[PDB]
Amino acid sequence: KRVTIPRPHQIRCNCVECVSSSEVDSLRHSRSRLNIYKALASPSLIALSSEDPILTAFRLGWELKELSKVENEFKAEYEEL
Amino acid sequence: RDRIPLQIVRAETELSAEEKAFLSAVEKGDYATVKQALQEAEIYYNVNINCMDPLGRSALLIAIENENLEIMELLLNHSVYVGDALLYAIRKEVVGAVELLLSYRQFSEFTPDITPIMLAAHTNNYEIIKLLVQKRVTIPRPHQIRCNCVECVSSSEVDSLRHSRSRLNIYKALASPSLIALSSEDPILTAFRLGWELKELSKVENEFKAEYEELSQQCKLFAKDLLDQARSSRELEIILNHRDDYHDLAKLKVAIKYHQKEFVAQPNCQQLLATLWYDGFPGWRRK
Amino acid sequence: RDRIPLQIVRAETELSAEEKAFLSAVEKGDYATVKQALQEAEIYYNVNINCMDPLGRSALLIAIENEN
Amino acid sequence: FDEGGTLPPPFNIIRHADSLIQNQHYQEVIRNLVKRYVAAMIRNSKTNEGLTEENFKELKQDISSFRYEVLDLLGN
Amino acid sequence: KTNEGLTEENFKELKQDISSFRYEVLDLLGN
Ligand SMILES: [Zn+2]
Ligand SMILES: [Zn+2]
């Protein structure tokens, strides 16, 4: 059946949405990104819905480590993912 | 004489075979046999229903460890001797037998001071405690340290090994998470004032140092877990700014005067502060 | 005054006994009893099938954890 | 954090309703937190506990009683 | 009673109990 998953913005994005919501509720905005990144990194989904399952684990296990330096609160989580 | 004889030096009584088959039938689930033996023992008199197996187990304590709620009622409609049978059903956490025993209202494993409300708090059930507090109960109050009344000095010299156990029992009863979350008005400020005076007691009583020290640790994780269950920012702002009896952090300063190192080293509390130490510099994401 | 009283400070609602036996029969597997109680509750009105046990579990969340 | 206006060393020589509404607001958060904590702690026990010898006996007794009652009904 | 684990011996007794129950019930009912 037809489903869909949202798309997270790039780091240091500076749109009006990323700066307005990040100052009205700052504890709820920092949880959806972690949930999405935990959803996107599962082995079964990558082996089921990717065109090249080897080159998609190289470009995604490299930009989960840069995120481990700007977000000091969830260092262990991002590191383990 | 190069052999060693063997014999029993401390003898006790033995039972008869007629009695034996009764307890043997209770242990297997036969319901049509025991119901007969209960009936012939009212016209003729050959068996007593209050016997005891070699290990001190009677006919009512075997049907509790095997959870059978259909033989208990059958033994209870007949007049049997119910002694300390309510303390054996709270140690083994079952719910139906508890009620059932409540409704039909010289050897043991428990000291002569244990009460049901105190034994149900050593274990950590939430459903059993709520059934005993709807009825009226009470727990004693311990005196302050270095108290000097006539009672504290007279009893402490007639029996000094029994007087040092009730205080430990009471302090183990008072420090359970469920009771604090069920019967307190402020569940956060009562774990600060109680996890601080269980450590002073660890210096005057050299015998139970480890016990008191470990009891002081169950009161430091409760507050942290209760705090990290939040789902928004307004809830954090309301909690950390509560003053009993303006808008400054009037509850994060009381946690520093008590040396609580896990309540002030949490991601949320360390992210609320970083937005006030960098006021005037909207972005620190630079080279 | 050397005693400490105890009471509940945050009260909630309680259920009735008639309802109690319904949820008690759902937890044991009785299929011929619950099918009757579902039927008398359509001519007479004495039980609501959307009750909740003390722990927030309804009549449909008990039959999921026991795979029936 | 406090307003002291501390200059560097050299230049250093020259009523009911509010309480009621706060106490009314403070309780619902506590109630919800207690609910969630109790639920989580009850759930956590279901998954991380092993088995022992006590359960084998109850299973055996159940089978035994079932057999005995069925035999009693069928035989007579 | 509290600090002992399970092993393979108990599974066999349970299986044998079920088997004997089934056999005796089938013997009575069938004939
Ligand atoms: Zn963003
Ligand atoms: Zn004293």
Side-chain angles (χ1 to χ4, degrees), chain B residues 121-140:
Chain B
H122 293 186
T123 71
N124 217 359
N125 288 318
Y126 190 83
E127 290 68 20
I128 292 186
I129 295 187
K130 211 201 314 183
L131 299 184
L132 300 158
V133 292
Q134 286 168 165
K135 294 182 183 293
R136 314 318 308 176
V137 202
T138 182
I139 283 183

Side-chain angles (χ1 to χ4, degrees), chain A residues 11-14 24-28 30 70-71 73-74, chain B residues 230-234 236 266-268 270-271 275 285-286:
Chain A
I11 210 82
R12 312 185 178 97
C13 169
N14 242 342
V24 305
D25 219 352
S26 159
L27 176 59
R28 177 208 298 175
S30 170
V70 197
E71 308 274 9
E73 312 319 324
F74 289 124
Chain B
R231 272 184 206 170
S232 51
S233 323
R234 187 56 186 162
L236 262 185
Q266 179 174 349
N268 306 144
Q270 296 271 302
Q271 190 186 4
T275 78
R285 44 177 57 179
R286 306 159 176 179

Side-chain angles (χ1 to χ4, degrees), chain A residues 9-10 13 15 18 29 33:
Chain A
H9 292 167
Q10 187 43 242
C13 169
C15 51
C18 275
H29 178 67
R33 289 192 289 114

